[PDB]
Symmetry: C2
């Protein structure tokens, strides 16, 4: 299978510190799932309420098994309370180096 990259754009409606806490707990959850490779949370420079998360998984099935975990639900609910999300699943076509 090929690696998949999940890209999630967040518009944060409450306090960014609270969002980062909730996000940190979400990321720790995913980080102990089989097939998790890496993640980066990015904050937009000219804004205070704009974030993008990039998460890499070994394959599509590992990503969906993680998302299907009942243990994700509290994290999904908390994130939904604090933010509007637009997400997509991608594959990498070029990487340099």
């Amino acid at each position: 299978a090929d690696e998949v990259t999940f890209v999630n754009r967040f518009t944060v409606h409450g306090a960014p510190a609270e969002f980062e806490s909730v996000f940190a707990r979400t990321a720790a959850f995913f980080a102990r799932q089989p097939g998790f490779v890496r993640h980066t949370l990015l904050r937009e420079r000219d804004k205070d309420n704009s974030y993008v998360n990039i998460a890499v998984w070994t394959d599509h099935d590992a990503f969906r098994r993680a998302l299907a975990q009942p243990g994700f639900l509290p994290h999904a609910t908390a994130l939904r309370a604090l933010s509007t999300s637009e997400h997509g699943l991608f594959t990498a076509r070029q990487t340099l180096p």
Copy 2:
């Protein structure tokens, strides 16, 4: 500031995706010769032919800006403008695992 910057550029490709990808490879190689270039990833949305995201990391904003100001960037920018629409943002990494 002196913070590492991550440039996120979302593209809708209206010409041939193969031509878009080829132009991008040459664009990335140009950037790879620029001081302060860290890494480049071109992502394609799964089961869309026409939706891409470039993630480009630079040691700081000034190194990025200077790269975009080089005369050598112009042919690449010109080719991308012929083939795609795009929306960009500049970000700083907040969390990583």
